Design a protein around this ligand. Sequence first.
Ligand SMILES: Cc1ccc2sc(CO)cc2c1
Ligand SMILES: Cc1ccc2sc(CO)cc2c1
Ligand SMILES: Cc1ccc2sc(CO)cc2c1
Ligand SMILES: Cc1ccc2sc(CO)cc2c1
Lengths: 193, 193
Amino acid sequence: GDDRELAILATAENLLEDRPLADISVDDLAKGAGISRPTFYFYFPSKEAVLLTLLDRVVNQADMALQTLAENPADTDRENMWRTGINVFFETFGSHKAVTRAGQAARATSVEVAELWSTFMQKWIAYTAAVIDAERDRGAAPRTLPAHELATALNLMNERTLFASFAGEQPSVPEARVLDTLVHIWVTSIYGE
Amino acid sequence: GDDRELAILATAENLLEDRPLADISVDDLAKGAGISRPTFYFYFPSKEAVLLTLLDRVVNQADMALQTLAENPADTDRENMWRTGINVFFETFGSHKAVTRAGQAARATSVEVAELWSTFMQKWIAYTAAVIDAERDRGAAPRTLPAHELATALNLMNERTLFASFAGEQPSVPEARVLDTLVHIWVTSIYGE
Ligand SMILES: Cc1ccc2sc(CO)cc2c1
Ligand SMILES: Cc1ccc2sc(CO)cc2c1
Ligand SMILES: Cc1ccc2sc(CO)cc2c1
Ligand SMILES: Cc1ccc2sc(CO)cc2c1
């Protein structure tokens, strides 16, 4: 039932480790899922909708993990609080690099992919800004830039910088250094005068 | 002579304000330059090579402006020194938003476009890192992250953040606020403990 659907998704995510979506045919997905090409189309209109579903699950997995942190504060310093939260994105997207890479490509051609990404970035920026505001209200952070503008740039930094590490781009921060790098830039810019 | 070449480039940059490169034909470029389609191909192998030339000139215009700042230090504080340098990218790419937007798209499909971008980002990161190192040697900046890793993330922040402002993306920092936003994040992360 929904098992044939998982088979298509797992075949898609596995095939994206090797080649781009343009190099993957519907026949490839059906064969890997052990169904016919017409049977495929009963679960998905296109290979793009398969990628969209994959990307939706990764993004919602990150968002839910961040949701879980928010409701359970980790008893630790402010630097570590920020570290733990940025780590959700490092670990979640870093555990799904093929989908992250293919989703980024799809933003140029899929309105749904762009709108999905944009919606969750908006959500994460707003929550970053609220935490910054809370820190300012309690006197732990100085009132420097507008909180939402600062939060926007930091979250766009993470998007671009994590993606480059995962993709092995030149230039990029080494994957084993990128978390420490982003944390330093967040904490100095949030708490620095 | 080279005048027919400028006509093609100026037609291309003007046409990219209205539609993407895929929506622009070689006939459109020839007509706008007042030459035939075969005459076009004597100056350029393809419409992609036209975009590549446009992007090369914008990037080299930024790099040369940054070169000029480096050789003439502006008598001013450290915050302003960084402001003046980030402003070169704000003003140069912001004066060529159609080409900047089309060049970014081309990175996904043109090896030359990606290699051109990557080469100059490497160059600008290395120079950022040298200035950070110089500041540390003179005791003005603390020895926190590796200078080259810090410089990488800040320069990737600017790339992603300026592009989003220019493109009117959601989310983005307003174009009239993005320079102040980036400067704050650079100065706090370079000089902050
Ligand atoms: C990347 C990212 C986005 C939002 C938040 S909120 C927070 C403190 O709980 C850390 C964090 C990190
Ligand atoms: C804070 C933050 C927000 C969005 C994104 S997207 C990504 C990899 O695509 C890492 C990341 C980090
Ligand atoms: C964006 C960018 C890149 C390199 C440099 S160097 C400098 C100080 O002269 C400011 C600056 C800004
Ligand atoms: C510091 C720096 C380096 C590269 C780039 S690219 C860009 C718009 O595409 C702005 C920018 C800024």
